[PDB]
Amino acid sequence: VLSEGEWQLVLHVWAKVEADVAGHGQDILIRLFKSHPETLEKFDRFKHLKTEAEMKASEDLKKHGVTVLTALGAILKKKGHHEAELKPLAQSHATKHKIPIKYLEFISEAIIHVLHSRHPGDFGADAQGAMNKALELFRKDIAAKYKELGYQG
Ligand SMILES: C=CC1=C(C)/C(=C/c2[nH]c(/C=C3N=C(/C=C4\NC(=O)C(C)=C4C=C)C(C)=C\3CCC(=O)O)c(CCC(=O)O)c2C)NC1=O
Which domains, and CATH codes, for the chain? Predict the structure, then answer.
C-alpha cells in the first residue's frame, strides 16, 4: 500500500514526465526494445525498426509512447483507485494484443530506468520505491483481470 506522501512523490515526478511526454515515451520504448527485442514483434506498424536512429525518427513509435504514458498518467493520478481505467486496458491486452505479465514487468523496468536517468535530482530511493509499488499494483490488478478473462500470458 502506498502512503499519501508516496503517491505525491509519484505524481511530482509525473508532472515532469508531462512536460515532455513524447521524449519520455521514446526513451522508454527504445530502452524496452533494445533490452528485450522480442517485445517489438507485437507492433505491426513498426516492428521492422532496428537502429536507434530509425526508432527516434518513427512517428508510429513516438505516438505509441504518448499513448502509453497518457494512459499511465491517468492511472497514477487515481492513486490506486483505478479499476475503471484498468478495465478497458486489461480487456485489449488479454483478448487482442495478448501482452504477457513478463512484458508488463519489462516495460515497468524501462519506465523506472528512464525516470531515474532523466530526473536523478529528485527521483531518489523513496520516489523510485513509490513508483515501483505503484507499477507493481498496476501489474497486480491487470494480472487479476487477465486471469478472470482466462488469459494465462
Ligand atoms: C504501463 C504500460 C502500458 C500502458 C498503460 C499501455 C497502454 C496502452 N497500450 C495500448 C495499445 C497497445 N499496447 C500494446 C503493447 C504493449 N502494452 C504493454 O503493456 C506492453 C508491455 C506492450 C508491449 C510489449 C500493443 C501491441 C498495442 C496496440 C498498438 C497499435 O495497434 O497501435 C493502448 C491503446 C488502447 C488499447 O489497445 O487498449 C493503450 C491505452 N501500454 C503499456 O505499455
Answer: 1-153 (1.10.490.10)
